Each structure stands twice: as structure tokens, then as C-alpha cells.
Amino acid sequence: FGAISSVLNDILSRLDPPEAEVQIDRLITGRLQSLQTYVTQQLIRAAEI
């Protein structure tokens, strides 16, 4: 999602907080968008069933 790693603990075990926060924000944004996509498609499939 634009950050330096897909592993959260590798960001935590490498960088101090004031710029590790910026990478963690990109991870949070991408993963939250994936959850919203999944929930919307599950709602529509539940309507069909």
C-alpha cells in the first residue's frame, strides 16, 4: 500500500514512532478499505440468498 513493508512488526522493530506512524497510517488505510469492500459484497450476496 505504499509503505516499506507489509509486516507491521518489521515497521515497529526498525523505526522510532514519529515517522513509523506515517507508514502505519498507509497500512491502516489500505486494510480498512479491503474490509469495507468485503462487507459490502457480503451484504449484497446475503440479499440474493
Partner: protein, 49 residues
């Protein structure tokens, strides 16, 4: 078809998996996760109905 599988997702283990700094950063986004758990719980009840 009558029903589909009842699936539950937990945000804070999915998004900020076992971290404290990520949890504190996630609290600035308000109430997305209660919304997602509410929607998925609604689907899981409607299957048994």
C-alpha cells in the same frame, strides 16, 4: 439455496494485528469497526432466520 456460512471478522486483530501503537492510531478513525461488526452480525442472524 437457503443459507450461507456465518462468518465473523474482528477488525483489531485483522487490521492492527497484535499491536498497541496501531490500536491507538486506529482509534482516531471513529467507529468503523463497530459498524462492520454490526453489519456482519446482522447477516449471521438472518441466516438462521
Amino acid at each position: 439455496p437457503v443459507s450461507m456460512t456465518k462468518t465473523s471478522v474482528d477488525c483489531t486483530m485483522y487490521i492492527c494485528g497484535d499491536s498497541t501503537e496501531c490500536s491507538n492510531l486506529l482509534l482516531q478513525y471513529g467507529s468503523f469497526c463497530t459498524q462492520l461488526n454490526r453489519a456482519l452480525t446482522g447477516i449471521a442472524v438472518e441466516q438462521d432466520k
